[PDB]
Ligand SMILES: CCCCCCCCCCCCn1cc[n+](CC(P(=O)(O)O)P(=O)(O)O)c1
Ligand SMILES: CCCCCCCCCCCCn1cc[n+](CC(P(=O)(O)O)P(=O)(O)O)c1
Ligand SMILES: [Mg+2]
Ligand SMILES: [Mg+2]
Ligand SMILES: [Mg+2]
Ligand SMILES: [Mg+2]
Ligand SMILES: [Mg+2]
């Protein structure tokens with residue numbers, strides 16, 4: 001748990017040491033090293049490390065204790081999920097026009113970096129994961145399975161990101177391969193404002209890589225066979241938790257304090273399909289629906305304030321607090337159907353310290 | 356060869372079919388399908404397919420035969436390289452502010468798409484490769500090596516792309532002033548750095564951004580699938596020939612940027628204005644007068660018609676064409692000469708054939 005945070009250097013340096021065997025001039029290696037060490041440090045560190053820790057804990061509680069070389073393998077997987085979260089966040093911040101991430105400037109904003117490097121850096125971070133899993137796990141029998149779990153969890157995440165970005169776009173309300181001139185002014189589409197669609201989005205963009213992936217990694221490494229019916233249970237629990245997690249993320253966007261979140265709220269002006277939007281829309285008068293349509297999704301101070309004051313008016317805080325409690329019970333109740341004391345504990349623990 | 360282009364549908368749909376197993380609402384499935392089918396068609400089609408055909412041919416001419424299900428596995432690897440080329444290109448065109456690719460608008464320029472979709476679409480195209488390799492090769496014994504070969508060739512391409520993109524940047528000149536993590540405000544106005552204008556640095560760059568994925572990768576794919584063991588000393592010879600061919604390929608690409616005709620190349624030149632370390636730039640710089648050096652420093656790397664014209668009219672004054680022609684002939688011989696030290700008639704044949712049709716295709 002604090003052992004985890006100590007190993008970071010080792011995994012970071014094992015990758016950087018791969019790059020350094022490349023066939024390059026020495027001065028050029030020096031530059032590569034400088035740049036990519038900062039890419040890792042700036043983007044991998046400063047998080048809560050929930051996903052990484054969940055790998056460690058699942059591994060430990062499925063087993064009956066664990067030598068130092070086994071911890072090396074588990075910690076690798078833990079740091080691989082964190083590297084994945086780093087990549088996802090660097091990409092998300094490009095897509096959502098981020099300002100601040102973990103209390104500092106978004107990577108893509110930096111004048112030495114820009115969008116062109118940040119795009120290139122994401123794919124690098126992504127691929128570094130698989131090189132690290134090779135270095136430390138190429139000889140484990142769970143090897144192929146672990147790498148399929150990263151690959152599939154990623155694919156789902158990309159699909160959710162696509163939905164999150166396009167769900168309101170004209171695409172969805174044929175793609176014009178001749179239009180490069182006429183930009184789509186963002187509007188909300190009333191038909192897509194429902195929980196069914198929301199759940200589709202958040203389960204894919206969040207649930208698989210934040211929950212399913214770390215848990216499965218621990219399980220795979222501890223040697224639970226891929227065919228055990230437990231995996232399907234863990235998948236369902238993961239969906240519940242991801243939905244729980246993302247709804248809380250949505251709530252923080254409006255109601256959180258950015259000095260504590262480390263990031264600036266932006267869902268309203270970015271025209272996002274969020275929980276607060278859906279809830280308000282389900283609750284509000286017909287004129288207030290018209291007001292939302294006219295005001296949502298505009299980078300414009302008075303507009304955002306109207307949507308804000310609607311969230312207060314319809315008591316979205318209170319409705320969240322009320323969602324949080326029902327969903328927590330529903331999750332706990334699914335957890336108790338696992339029939340595995342070790343995993344059930346870790347998931348209950350996770351639930352407590354998730355925020 | 357035309358068998359290869361026929362198989363495309365099968366691999367595209369195999370992946371599309373996988374997406375369509377996802378737990379989503381039926382109408383959302385319909386939208387996903389329609390978007391991602393176009394993603395693949397728009398970007399995977401219309402190329403010369405050199406890298407893909409190189410896999411097919413290597414597969415064939417190591418072997419002495421091959422049934423329809425062995426070919427299905429090879430064709431898959433062939434299309435996977437073409438998917439990889441599609442992804443690299445969508446990403447390149449973002450990085451290089453492209454206008455035109457294969458005679459149409461770059462994917463990222465489309466108003467239905469934009470940068471935020473194209474970036475997401477690249478990782479998608481990337482991962483689709485590994486899903487395809489799993490569908491068709493999960494039981495082959497060469498499986499784990501194949502996916503390592505993609506992974507590693509990709510890593511080298513990315514590093515090449517970083518150098519291609521940063522080699523003249525303050526990052527690399529100042530080099531002793533660290534990356535300022537507090538500057539989002541003051542944008543680096545781009546200038547060339549004279550210390551980097553040499554072939555050694557060039558070769559570093561083009562070997563990584565071009566040679567590994569365009570030559571090493573497809574060849575090693577065919578070889579791994581046909582059954583040559585990963586320890587055979589021929590791989591290291593194939594590596595060295597790949598370096599030579601990639602160098603040779605990129606220098607030609609650089610030549611096309613300035614001297615090509617864009618209705619034939621399918622893309623608009625942009626190296627001078629994007630501040631790229633190119634072969635023409637280095638040749639000129641090695642030949643030209645001292646005042647002409649200064650003129651290059653002032654004018655190179657500005658999106659600015661008069662400035663471009665200056666550089667371009669320098670390339671014409673020092674006759675960079677001729678110099679290219681003279682490079683092309685010497686490098687070709689150097690490559691033929693290496694190919695003949697393979698001691699493998701099939702591969703040697705395929706590489707010599709590749710050399711003939713590299714710029715023309717088919
Ligand atoms: C979403 C971010 C993750 C994905 C990022 C992938 C990064 C790797 C991109 C490598 C592109 C290498 N490559 C080599 C050759 N060119 C052709 C062009 P030129 O080298 O730019 O001249 P051309 O435009 O002339 O055809 C491109
Ligand atoms: C190959 C390079 C191309 C990029 C390919 C990878 C793109 C996939 C992006 C996955 C990110 C999903 N993800 C889930 C959670 N959030 C957090 C933010 P939210 O935007 O509110 O969901 P927040 O900024 O509020 O914390 C992001
Ligand atoms: Mg987002
Ligand atoms: Mg965001
Ligand atoms: Mg958010
Ligand atoms: Mg480029
Ligand atoms: Mg280019």
Ligand SMILES: [Mg+2]
Nearest residue numbers: 608609612626
């Ligand atoms: Mg070029």
